Amino acid sequence: HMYYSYGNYEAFARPKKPENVENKSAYLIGSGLASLAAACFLIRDGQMEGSKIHILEELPKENHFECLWDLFRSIPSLEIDNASVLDEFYWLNKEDPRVIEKQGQRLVTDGDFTLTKTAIKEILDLCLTNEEDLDDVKITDVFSDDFFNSNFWIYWKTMFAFEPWHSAMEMRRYLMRFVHYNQYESLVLPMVEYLKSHGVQFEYDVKVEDIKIDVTTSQKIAREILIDRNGNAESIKLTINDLVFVTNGSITESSTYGDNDTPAPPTDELGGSWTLWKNLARQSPEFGNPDKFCQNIPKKSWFVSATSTTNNKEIIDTIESICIITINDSAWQMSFTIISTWIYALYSDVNGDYIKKPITECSGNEICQEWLYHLGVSTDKIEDLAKHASNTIPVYMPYITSYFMTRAIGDRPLVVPHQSQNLAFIGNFAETERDTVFTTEYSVRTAMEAVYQLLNIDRGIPEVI
Amino acid sequence: HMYYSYGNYEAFARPKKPENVENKSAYLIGSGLASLAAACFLIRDGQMEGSKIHILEELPKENHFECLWDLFRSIPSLEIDNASVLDEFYWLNKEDPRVIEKQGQRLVTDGDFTLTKTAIKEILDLCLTNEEDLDDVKITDVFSDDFFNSNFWIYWKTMFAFEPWHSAMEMRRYLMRFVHYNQYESLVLPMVEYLKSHGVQFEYDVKVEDIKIDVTTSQKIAREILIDRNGNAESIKLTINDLVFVTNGSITESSTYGDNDTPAPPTDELGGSWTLWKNLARQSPEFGNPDKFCQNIPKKSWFVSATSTTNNKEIIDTIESICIITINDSAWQMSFTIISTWIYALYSDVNGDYIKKPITECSGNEICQEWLYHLGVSTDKIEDLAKHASNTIPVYMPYITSYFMTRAIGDRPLVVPHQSQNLAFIGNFAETERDTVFTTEYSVRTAMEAVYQLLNIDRGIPEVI
């Protein structure tokens, strides 16, 4: 029971309070962006009191994003008073509005798409095919080598971190959608403050083991949850009125950290979100297949990201003389963007240019050495500048490319599954209609759809334009 | 300047306060829907204090309408507490969701459009032509006799009161826009209450004779206004900061009233708004041509409208037995809708079926006679039922179809004219882009565009979609 809608009629309309909310409670696994968004939607649109919403936390203690700006309309900002988050964002965007190769030289064909006619034909072919017919299709299964040599492909694969073995459905969604102050500080903190103002319960030191579901021929109910509250394995019972919102899968789980002298160790340890999705998938076929995302990830995929902080003047002067920025000729496909800068290498199991080791075996100083080499900096003063004038902290994400893995319909469970009474899935791994993963709008849209379907809120979810 | 926008980013975004507004005042001639909308936009979006807003009043005392719902978002309702007007409208429409002939018989081809292929081809050819190429083009210059016999022409000419001699530009706008109790109680009263809450000044017994403008090669300023305050003709001076909003033209002006025994006498008496527009057009050529709307109106056009109230049982029983409703066979093209019913006849100078007199010469009792006649009521008991069991009040509006008269580009002045500093034109007779006249949306959009252009408010006006 939901419907998509557009325009100012359904944007500003406040829905009526759904029936029987006052006897309903909410339990939300995780405290990610989608979880906090769902909590805020339950507080505002669903009118659910703060005492009945529980947020379980593991650790102790662009303009056309319709769902995102719908959510961040009643969320007050924390820096300037009598204003919201969208208010600050709009004011900041109205007050204050690329590729290098051969060690520093800017690309001469910058700005030009350099798309041949056959590449434009293949782009139209990918866009015009149905999503149902693109099940389990790689990027290399739809494009020829003419397109992979174009500068447009370089921009697309660096801006969105795509790979030739990624999902064709998600690239089609990206092409459809994008045809025309990080998130933690700007978005997560205001929602935390708003939820704490409304008195949402936050339970820490909670590791959710699994959720016992019962599946009948007519309706499916989340019957019970086994969690690990502060080390004690215990159980919380559920009714049909006690809704459950699971953020299945996590792209930042099992992320090992490195330092400036040792490399970050690779790992394949499945985390709490992945184990919970696996346990849920054992109960019913329509809960998605986690193994299509968390298993058999190619070793050439993006795994390591580094951050380089420096106060040295001459590196900054070199960067200013140069000018996101992409090293086109690097074997690692290194791309760095803006003090402290952020570096990520796409290919992982390929030897580097200046240091002939893969990014998995390279420590922070080695990454800094090769990034300085590709910046056009001389090879004489390179070593001391990289080792001592700057600090490079790597981090190895083993699941940072899981949302872009090839999927079929049913690999991602629906936001509220068929015949589900009180169980919903949110985050980047919930199947929705015509929205691009790895964006805040995706997580917010999943949270809103979950809340609106579970509570039967009669207000149109803004459709994707 | 101004820019159009769509989506939830610009919908919810509150604009910053424009500079130098604390030294600006506003004077708004008339108290029509557009003037109230402009005052409300100045109060909310312009952040102008109510003491600087003057409303001069003569007499003493569908879902995709983007601009209308943008205006009626912060306006509080009057009937229920803690809700807006849009909230009431949304809740009311979610809680509670034709042609007859030969004296009672419903149309056999009812429901079907019955548009021939040539008619669809003409519709497409009209819709695909640019608006600039249709200057002073009648409806009959673009459609053939095949289109005029379709039931779709019946629906279009009765729903929107179109005529064969009307502007093809406005019909093109209507076809492009709509391809996919009363308004006084629900809209005007809440805005009146909101403005009174904010302290907006209301001057009564004020008759605006004219506005002395000075026009330079670089800018044009409303310098002075000559009005008639309570019978004393006096003058108010203006600065560049004192903005002026004129509702040029009025379709409800100079409306003579009739009764159940005598007809409403036809007239051609120019009202205050038409006189004000005529005084203004003489000063500058780009202020539009009132003579194209207030003069040479064809005598067959819709003039007379009646309201019939009854407490009799059998008439209401007959009405319920029959079932807006259109009498297709009537020579008057009489159409009635729902107690008290409202009757209007498009053709004016043609003898009726039962009474062989035109509607101009027919008194209210006669209108009730022929209306009962076309309803299937027998010709025996008609006279006493029409004269005594119901009361019919007619009214002759001589400008009820002036917005549809054939016009050229520049016949209607711009919402804010080129090189105009403090003079704006709002209402149905102000030229804007891709909006349909004789709608609340048009008046509200003209008000919003005038306020935003004059105050340079950096917020995107919701474009027509």
mmCIF file of N, CA, C and O in Angstrom, chain A residues 3 6-16 62-67 69-70 73 80 82-84 86-87 89-91 93-95 458-460 462 465, chain B residues 3 6-16 63-67 69-70 73 81-84 86-87 89-91 93-95 180 458-460 462 465:
data_model
loop_
_atom_site.group_PDB
_atom_site.id
_atom_site.type_symbol
_atom_site.label_atom_id
_atom_site.label_comp_id
_atom_site.label_asym_id
_atom_site.label_seq_id
_atom_site.Cartn_x
_atom_site.Cartn_y
_atom_site.Cartn_z
ATOM 1 N N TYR A 3 2.206 4.585 -3.016
ATOM 2 C CA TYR A 3 2.121 5.155 -4.345
ATOM 3 C C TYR A 3 3.139 6.275 -4.467
ATOM 4 O O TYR A 3 3.368 7.022 -3.511
ATOM 5 N N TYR A 6 4.474 13.252 -7.446
ATOM 6 C CA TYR A 6 5.398 14.355 -7.680
ATOM 7 C C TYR A 6 4.656 15.684 -7.635
ATOM 8 O O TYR A 6 3.435 15.746 -7.790
ATOM 9 N N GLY A 7 5.405 16.747 -7.381
ATOM 10 C CA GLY A 7 4.876 18.096 -7.395
ATOM 11 C C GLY A 7 4.669 18.642 -5.991
ATOM 12 O O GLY A 7 4.815 17.948 -4.988
ATOM 13 N N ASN A 8 4.319 19.926 -5.935
ATOM 14 C CA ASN A 8 4.219 20.615 -4.654
ATOM 15 C C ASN A 8 2.989 20.226 -3.854
ATOM 16 O O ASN A 8 2.869 20.636 -2.696
ATOM 17 N N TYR A 9 2.055 19.494 -4.456
ATOM 18 C CA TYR A 9 0.869 19.065 -3.725
ATOM 19 C C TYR A 9 1.226 18.063 -2.641
ATOM 20 O O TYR A 9 0.831 18.215 -1.482
ATOM 21 N N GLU A 10 1.947 17.009 -3.011
ATOM 22 C CA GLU A 10 2.311 15.966 -2.066
ATOM 23 C C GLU A 10 3.593 16.282 -1.305
ATOM 24 O O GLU A 10 3.930 15.561 -0.357
ATOM 25 N N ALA A 11 4.311 17.334 -1.701
ATOM 26 C CA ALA A 11 5.548 17.693 -1.022
ATOM 27 C C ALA A 11 5.267 18.343 0.326
ATOM 28 O O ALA A 11 5.856 17.958 1.342
ATOM 29 N N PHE A 12 4.336 19.297 0.363
ATOM 30 C CA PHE A 12 4.047 20.048 1.577
ATOM 31 C C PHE A 12 2.875 19.503 2.371
ATOM 32 O O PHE A 12 2.587 20.049 3.436
ATOM 33 N N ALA A 13 2.197 18.461 1.888
ATOM 34 C CA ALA A 13 1.004 17.935 2.542
ATOM 35 C C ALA A 13 1.408 17.077 3.729
ATOM 36 O O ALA A 13 2.221 16.161 3.590
ATOM 37 N N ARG A 14 0.858 17.373 4.881
ATOM 38 C CA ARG A 14 1.160 16.538 6.039
ATOM 39 C C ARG A 14 0.176 15.378 6.123
ATOM 40 O O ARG A 14 -1.039 15.602 6.152
ATOM 41 N N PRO A 15 0.639 14.142 6.201
ATOM 42 C CA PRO A 15 -0.298 13.017 6.218
ATOM 43 C C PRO A 15 -1.025 12.938 7.545
ATOM 44 O O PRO A 15 -0.555 13.429 8.573
ATOM 45 N N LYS A 16 -2.195 12.307 7.514
ATOM 46 C CA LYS A 16 -2.908 12.050 8.754
ATOM 47 C C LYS A 16 -2.145 11.010 9.574
ATOM 48 O O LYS A 16 -1.357 10.224 9.044
ATOM 49 N N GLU A 62 23.490 15.715 -4.810
ATOM 50 C CA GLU A 62 23.027 16.770 -5.703
ATOM 51 C C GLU A 62 21.588 17.204 -5.425
ATOM 52 O O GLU A 62 20.952 16.687 -4.526
ATOM 53 N N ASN A 63 21.097 18.172 -6.206
ATOM 54 C CA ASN A 63 19.863 18.875 -5.866
ATOM 55 C C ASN A 63 18.628 18.001 -6.013
ATOM 56 O O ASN A 63 17.658 18.185 -5.270
ATOM 57 N N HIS A 64 18.659 17.023 -6.912
ATOM 58 C CA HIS A 64 17.486 16.220 -7.224
ATOM 59 C C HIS A 64 17.327 15.018 -6.300
ATOM 60 O O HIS A 64 16.752 13.991 -6.700
ATOM 61 N N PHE A 65 17.849 15.113 -5.082
ATOM 62 C CA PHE A 65 17.680 14.075 -4.070
ATOM 63 C C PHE A 65 16.381 14.368 -3.326
ATOM 64 O O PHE A 65 16.379 14.976 -2.257
ATOM 65 N N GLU A 66 15.262 13.913 -3.899
ATOM 66 C CA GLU A 66 13.946 14.276 -3.377
ATOM 67 C C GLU A 66 13.734 13.756 -1.960
ATOM 68 O O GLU A 66 13.324 14.510 -1.068
ATOM 69 N N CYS A 67 13.973 12.461 -1.742
ATOM 70 C CA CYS A 67 13.721 11.893 -0.423
ATOM 71 C C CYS A 67 14.653 12.490 0.623
ATOM 72 O O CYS A 67 14.236 12.721 1.764
ATOM 73 N N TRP A 69 15.976 15.574 0.722
ATOM 74 C CA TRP A 69 15.583 16.928 1.099
ATOM 75 C C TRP A 69 14.206 16.952 1.752
ATOM 76 O O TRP A 69 13.888 17.884 2.500
ATOM 77 N N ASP A 70 13.383 15.940 1.477
ATOM 78 C CA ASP A 70 12.145 15.748 2.224
ATOM 79 C C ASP A 70 12.427 15.417 3.685
ATOM 80 O O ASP A 70 11.773 15.946 4.590
ATOM 81 N N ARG A 73 14.114 18.442 6.069
ATOM 82 C CA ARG A 73 13.298 19.646 6.062
ATOM 83 C C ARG A 73 12.850 20.025 7.461
ATOM 84 O O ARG A 73 12.860 21.210 7.802
ATOM 85 N N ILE A 80 23.692 27.286 12.786
ATOM 86 C CA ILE A 80 22.953 28.544 12.775
ATOM 87 C C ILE A 80 21.534 28.274 13.261
ATOM 88 O O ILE A 80 20.954 27.214 12.989
ATOM 89 N N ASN A 82 17.400 28.847 14.127
ATOM 90 C CA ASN A 82 16.159 29.097 13.382
ATOM 91 C C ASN A 82 16.311 28.732 11.904
ATOM 92 O O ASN A 82 15.825 29.435 11.016
ATOM 93 N N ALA A 83 17.011 27.628 11.640
ATOM 94 C CA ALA A 83 17.194 27.131 10.282
ATOM 95 C C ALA A 83 17.350 25.620 10.293
ATOM 96 O O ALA A 83 17.763 25.022 11.290
ATOM 97 N N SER A 84 17.042 25.014 9.154
ATOM 98 C CA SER A 84 17.128 23.575 8.975
ATOM 99 C C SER A 84 18.388 23.211 8.198
ATOM 100 O O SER A 84 19.159 24.075 7.772
ATOM 101 N N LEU A 86 18.488 21.679 5.220
ATOM 102 C CA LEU A 86 18.327 22.111 3.839
ATOM 103 C C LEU A 86 18.524 23.611 3.724
ATOM 104 O O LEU A 86 19.048 24.096 2.720
ATOM 105 N N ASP A 87 18.095 24.362 4.740
ATOM 106 C CA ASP A 87 18.275 25.812 4.732
ATOM 107 C C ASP A 87 19.745 26.194 4.669
ATOM 108 O O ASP A 87 20.142 27.042 3.856
ATOM 109 N N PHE A 89 22.171 24.219 3.666
ATOM 110 C CA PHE A 89 22.723 23.703 2.418
ATOM 111 C C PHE A 89 22.415 24.628 1.245
ATOM 112 O O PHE A 89 23.317 24.973 0.472
ATOM 113 N N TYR A 90 21.161 25.067 1.123
ATOM 114 C CA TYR A 90 20.778 25.987 0.062
ATOM 115 C C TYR A 90 21.536 27.298 0.173
ATOM 116 O O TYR A 90 22.058 27.806 -0.825
ATOM 117 N N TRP A 91 21.599 27.871 1.379
ATOM 118 C CA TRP A 91 22.307 29.137 1.526
ATOM 119 C C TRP A 91 23.793 28.984 1.195
ATOM 120 O O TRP A 91 24.389 29.856 0.544
ATOM 121 N N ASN A 93 25.214 26.759 -0.817
ATOM 122 C CA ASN A 93 25.356 26.527 -2.246
ATOM 123 C C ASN A 93 25.030 27.757 -3.077
ATOM 124 O O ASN A 93 25.502 27.863 -4.214
ATOM 125 N N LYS A 94 24.236 28.685 -2.554
ATOM 126 C CA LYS A 94 24.016 29.912 -3.302
ATOM 127 C C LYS A 94 25.063 30.974 -2.992
ATOM 128 O O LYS A 94 25.282 31.871 -3.816
ATOM 129 N N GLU A 95 25.758 30.863 -1.864
ATOM 130 C CA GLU A 95 26.773 31.852 -1.557
ATOM 131 C C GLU A 95 28.142 31.481 -2.100
ATOM 132 O O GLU A 95 28.971 32.375 -2.277
ATOM 133 N N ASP A 458 -0.525 7.301 4.356
ATOM 134 C CA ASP A 458 -1.128 7.664 3.077
ATOM 135 C C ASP A 458 -0.583 9.018 2.632
ATOM 136 O O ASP A 458 -1.233 10.061 2.719
ATOM 137 N N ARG A 459 0.660 8.992 2.167
ATOM 138 C CA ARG A 459 1.304 10.159 1.585
ATOM 139 C C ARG A 459 2.256 9.667 0.511
ATOM 140 O O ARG A 459 2.998 8.712 0.732
ATOM 141 N N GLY A 460 2.252 10.342 -0.638
ATOM 142 C CA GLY A 460 3.048 9.883 -1.764
ATOM 143 C C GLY A 460 4.539 10.037 -1.524
ATOM 144 O O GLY A 460 5.019 11.115 -1.155
ATOM 145 N N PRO A 462 7.999 10.810 -2.957
ATOM 146 C CA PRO A 462 8.397 11.509 -4.190
ATOM 147 C C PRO A 462 9.163 10.583 -5.122
ATOM 148 O O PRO A 462 10.182 10.008 -4.744
ATOM 149 N N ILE A 465 12.934 11.478 -10.505
ATOM 150 C CA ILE A 465 12.790 12.170 -11.785
ATOM 151 C C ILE A 465 13.874 11.735 -12.773
ATOM 152 O O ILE A 465 14.663 10.832 -12.494
ATOM 153 N N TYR B 3 14.425 32.703 -12.014
ATOM 154 C CA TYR B 3 14.734 31.448 -12.675
ATOM 155 C C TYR B 3 13.719 30.415 -12.222
ATOM 156 O O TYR B 3 13.275 30.419 -11.072
ATOM 157 N N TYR B 6 12.386 23.053 -10.367
ATOM 158 C CA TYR B 6 11.470 21.990 -10.000
ATOM 159 C C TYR B 6 12.190 21.021 -9.079
ATOM 160 O O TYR B 6 13.423 20.958 -9.034
ATOM 161 N N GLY B 7 11.404 20.269 -8.334
ATOM 162 C CA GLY B 7 11.955 19.290 -7.430
ATOM 163 C C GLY B 7 11.867 19.760 -5.996
ATOM 164 O O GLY B 7 11.510 20.900 -5.698
ATOM 165 N N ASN B 8 12.192 18.834 -5.105
ATOM 166 C CA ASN B 8 12.075 19.108 -3.686
ATOM 167 C C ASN B 8 13.200 19.976 -3.138
ATOM 168 O O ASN B 8 13.110 20.391 -1.980
ATOM 169 N N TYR B 9 14.279 20.206 -3.897
ATOM 170 C CA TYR B 9 15.369 21.049 -3.397
ATOM 171 C C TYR B 9 14.931 22.501 -3.256
ATOM 172 O O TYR B 9 15.148 23.132 -2.216
ATOM 173 N N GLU B 10 14.337 23.056 -4.303
ATOM 174 C CA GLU B 10 13.871 24.427 -4.236
ATOM 175 C C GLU B 10 12.496 24.557 -3.616
ATOM 176 O O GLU B 10 12.078 25.680 -3.332
ATOM 177 N N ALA B 11 11.772 23.453 -3.437
ATOM 178 C CA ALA B 11 10.422 23.539 -2.892
ATOM 179 C C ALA B 11 10.447 23.915 -1.417
ATOM 180 O O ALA B 11 9.748 24.842 -0.987
ATOM 181 N N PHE B 12 11.264 23.220 -0.629
ATOM 182 C CA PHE B 12 11.288 23.422 0.812
ATOM 183 C C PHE B 12 12.264 24.507 1.253
ATOM 184 O O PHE B 12 12.267 24.864 2.435
ATOM 185 N N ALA B 13 13.074 25.045 0.343
ATOM 186 C CA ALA B 13 14.206 25.886 0.716
ATOM 187 C C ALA B 13 13.746 27.295 1.055
ATOM 188 O O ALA B 13 13.078 27.942 0.248
ATOM 189 N N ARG B 14 14.096 27.771 2.236
ATOM 190 C CA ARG B 14 13.649 29.120 2.592
ATOM 191 C C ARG B 14 14.660 30.154 2.109
ATOM 192 O O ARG B 14 15.845 30.047 2.437
ATOM 193 N N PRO B 15 14.242 31.173 1.367
ATOM 194 C CA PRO B 15 15.205 32.138 0.834
ATOM 195 C C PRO B 15 15.718 33.094 1.893
ATOM 196 O O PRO B 15 15.063 33.366 2.901
ATOM 197 N N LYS B 16 16.919 33.609 1.632
ATOM 198 C CA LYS B 16 17.509 34.625 2.488
ATOM 199 C C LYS B 16 16.772 35.947 2.312
ATOM 200 O O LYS B 16 16.151 36.210 1.281
ATOM 201 N N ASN B 63 -4.627 18.992 -8.807
ATOM 202 C CA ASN B 63 -3.547 18.799 -7.845
ATOM 203 C C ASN B 63 -2.205 19.354 -8.312
ATOM 204 O O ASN B 63 -1.337 19.612 -7.469
ATOM 205 N N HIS B 64 -2.003 19.556 -9.615
ATOM 206 C CA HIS B 64 -0.696 19.984 -10.098
ATOM 207 C C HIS B 64 -0.549 21.502 -10.146
ATOM 208 O O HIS B 64 0.202 22.005 -10.981
ATOM 209 N N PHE B 65 -1.218 22.243 -9.258
ATOM 210 C CA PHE B 65 -1.102 23.704 -9.176
ATOM 211 C C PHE B 65 0.069 24.035 -8.260
ATOM 212 O O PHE B 65 -0.085 24.130 -7.046
ATOM 213 N N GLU B 66 1.269 24.151 -8.835
ATOM 214 C CA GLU B 66 2.474 24.281 -8.013
ATOM 215 C C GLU B 66 2.491 25.590 -7.220
ATOM 216 O O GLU B 66 2.714 25.589 -6.004
ATOM 217 N N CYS B 67 2.266 26.719 -7.895
ATOM 218 C CA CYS B 67 2.356 28.018 -7.232
ATOM 219 C C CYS B 67 1.273 28.193 -6.173
ATOM 220 O O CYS B 67 1.526 28.756 -5.103
ATOM 221 N N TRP B 69 -0.197 25.826 -4.285
ATOM 222 C CA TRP B 69 0.118 25.074 -3.077
ATOM 223 C C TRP B 69 1.401 25.560 -2.426
ATOM 224 O O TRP B 69 1.615 25.316 -1.231
ATOM 225 N N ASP B 70 2.288 26.184 -3.205
ATOM 226 C CA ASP B 70 3.427 26.876 -2.614
ATOM 227 C C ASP B 70 2.961 28.035 -1.751
ATOM 228 O O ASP B 70 3.512 28.273 -0.668
ATOM 229 N N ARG B 73 0.856 26.991 1.800
ATOM 230 C CA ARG B 73 1.611 26.073 2.633
ATOM 231 C C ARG B 73 1.803 26.624 4.031
ATOM 232 O O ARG B 73 1.605 25.899 5.009
ATOM 233 N N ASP B 81 -7.831 23.375 13.779
ATOM 234 C CA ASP B 81 -6.617 23.916 14.363
ATOM 235 C C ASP B 81 -5.418 23.073 13.959
ATOM 236 O O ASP B 81 -5.554 21.916 13.545
ATOM 237 N N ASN B 82 -4.238 23.702 14.051
ATOM 238 C CA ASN B 82 -2.939 23.063 13.819
ATOM 239 C C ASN B 82 -2.877 22.401 12.441
ATOM 240 O O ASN B 82 -2.368 21.291 12.288
ATOM 241 N N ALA B 83 -3.430 23.068 11.432
ATOM 242 C CA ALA B 83 -3.346 22.576 10.065
ATOM 243 C C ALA B 83 -3.317 23.766 9.130
ATOM 244 O O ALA B 83 -3.764 24.861 9.475
ATOM 245 N N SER B 84 -2.781 23.537 7.940
ATOM 246 C CA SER B 84 -2.728 24.547 6.900
ATOM 247 C C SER B 84 -3.907 24.354 5.952
ATOM 248 O O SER B 84 -4.723 23.444 6.112
ATOM 249 N N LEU B 86 -3.533 23.679 2.707
ATOM 250 C CA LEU B 86 -3.177 22.508 1.912
ATOM 251 C C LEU B 86 -3.437 21.222 2.688
ATOM 252 O O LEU B 86 -3.824 20.203 2.107
ATOM 253 N N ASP B 87 -3.236 21.259 4.007
ATOM 254 C CA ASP B 87 -3.544 20.112 4.854
ATOM 255 C C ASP B 87 -5.026 19.783 4.819
ATOM 256 O O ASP B 87 -5.408 18.614 4.688
ATOM 257 N N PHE B 89 -7.160 20.594 2.463
ATOM 258 C CA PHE B 89 -7.516 20.146 1.118
ATOM 259 C C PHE B 89 -7.069 18.712 0.884
ATOM 260 O O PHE B 89 -7.820 17.899 0.332
ATOM 261 N N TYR B 90 -5.867 18.371 1.337
ATOM 262 C CA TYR B 90 -5.371 17.014 1.169
ATOM 263 C C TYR B 90 -6.225 16.023 1.955
ATOM 264 O O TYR B 90 -6.636 14.979 1.429
ATOM 265 N N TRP B 91 -6.511 16.341 3.222
ATOM 266 C CA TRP B 91 -7.308 15.443 4.050
ATOM 267 C C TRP B 91 -8.727 15.305 3.511
ATOM 268 O O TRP B 91 -9.293 14.205 3.529
ATOM 269 N N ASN B 93 -9.717 15.649 0.355
ATOM 270 C CA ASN B 93 -9.740 14.860 -0.868
ATOM 271 C C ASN B 93 -9.359 13.402 -0.642
ATOM 272 O O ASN B 93 -9.686 12.550 -1.476
ATOM 273 N N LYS B 94 -8.651 13.095 0.440
ATOM 274 C CA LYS B 94 -8.367 11.697 0.737
ATOM 275 C C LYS B 94 -9.494 11.037 1.516
ATOM 276 O O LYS B 94 -9.605 9.806 1.507
ATOM 277 N N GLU B 95 -10.336 11.825 2.184
ATOM 278 C CA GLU B 95 -11.451 11.243 2.915
ATOM 279 C C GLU B 95 -12.710 11.108 2.068
ATOM 280 O O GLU B 95 -13.586 10.314 2.423
ATOM 281 N N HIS B 180 -2.560 15.407 -19.445
ATOM 282 C CA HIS B 180 -2.519 14.222 -18.595
ATOM 283 C C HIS B 180 -3.815 14.076 -17.826
ATOM 284 O O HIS B 180 -4.722 13.394 -18.298
ATOM 285 N N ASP B 458 16.148 35.340 -4.216
ATOM 286 C CA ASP B 458 16.902 34.286 -4.893
ATOM 287 C C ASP B 458 16.325 32.930 -4.502
ATOM 288 O O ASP B 458 16.894 32.174 -3.716
ATOM 289 N N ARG B 459 15.172 32.613 -5.083
ATOM 290 C CA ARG B 459 14.525 31.332 -4.859
ATOM 291 C C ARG B 459 13.774 30.964 -6.121
ATOM 292 O O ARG B 459 13.130 31.818 -6.734
ATOM 293 N N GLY B 460 13.861 29.696 -6.510
ATOM 294 C CA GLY B 460 13.327 29.277 -7.787
ATOM 295 C C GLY B 460 11.820 29.184 -7.753
ATOM 296 O O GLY B 460 11.253 28.460 -6.918
ATOM 297 N N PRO B 462 8.435 27.680 -8.822
ATOM 298 C CA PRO B 462 8.073 26.364 -9.371
ATOM 299 C C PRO B 462 7.485 26.487 -10.769
ATOM 300 O O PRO B 462 6.416 27.068 -10.963
ATOM 301 N N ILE B 465 4.322 22.318 -14.725
ATOM 302 C CA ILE B 465 4.540 20.928 -15.105
ATOM 303 C C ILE B 465 3.230 20.158 -15.029
ATOM 304 O O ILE B 465 2.214 20.698 -14.578
#
